[PDB]
Amino acid sequence: MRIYQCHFCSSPCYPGHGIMFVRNDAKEFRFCRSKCHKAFKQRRNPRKLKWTKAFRKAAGKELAVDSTLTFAQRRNVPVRYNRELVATTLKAMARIEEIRQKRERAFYKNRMRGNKEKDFLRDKKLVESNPELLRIREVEIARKLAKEQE
Amino acid sequence: AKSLRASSHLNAKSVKRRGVFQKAVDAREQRISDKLKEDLLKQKLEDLKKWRDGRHHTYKKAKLMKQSKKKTSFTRF
């Protein structure tokens, strides 16, 4: 058994999940769920559907070229078994998942740096633009403090 | 072909029962019995961390007198 990836949204298709389509070219098309299968039958482009991983990679929503993302490849030529090699492999995978999660957090922060000052520019433009409700605000705090005395 | 109630297939089944199958049943049972003994031992080990009567006599006498007094007795008249 292995996790395949949905031909549409790159999601994990575990054993017993989704369906598969085989063309006249022996090219199997795994799908994680009927959503992706139906979107494929309808000839929808997965690179223009924002919820697919192909779109997020092509547009740059998520990091694409990395060192951690090169370690998982389909191993054509196999290697003989070895407990030490496979235990180092399991430890390696535990390390790679951590490092790749850290790097994707870093990439997302890079993507969302600059949101702070732009949102502050929006807030300053709103407060500059609407002083009348600001006067209303001042009156409401004034009533609050006048009431808070006993 | 051969039915469920077939004597031939049932006899082949019966020859097979006494071999690997009853062996596996009895061994499985021994293992489960040992697990039960472990379980009771563990429970007692956490434990250390800390006529018939007058009711039944009157009940039966009344029931039999009601059955003899309504003529509703299976056993007597």
Binding site: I3, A72, Q73, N82, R83, T89, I96, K102 | -
Partner: protein, 71 residues
Amino acid sequence: RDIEAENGGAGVFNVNLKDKYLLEDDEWKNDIMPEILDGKNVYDFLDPEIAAKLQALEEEEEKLENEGFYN
């Protein structure tokens, strides 16, 4: 057939395919190779010299730390 015959017959002899393959140690002859871990194909991460790539990754990552990548 002879081992098959004294262990139960044609359809009853459960052949151990494992006791005939060739390893650096017969003590891991019958050991189970894991398939799945945290959603990743172990076979696809399986690689000789995985320690080399892993250590190169570790060097690059602690360099990224000391260079200030996660400030």
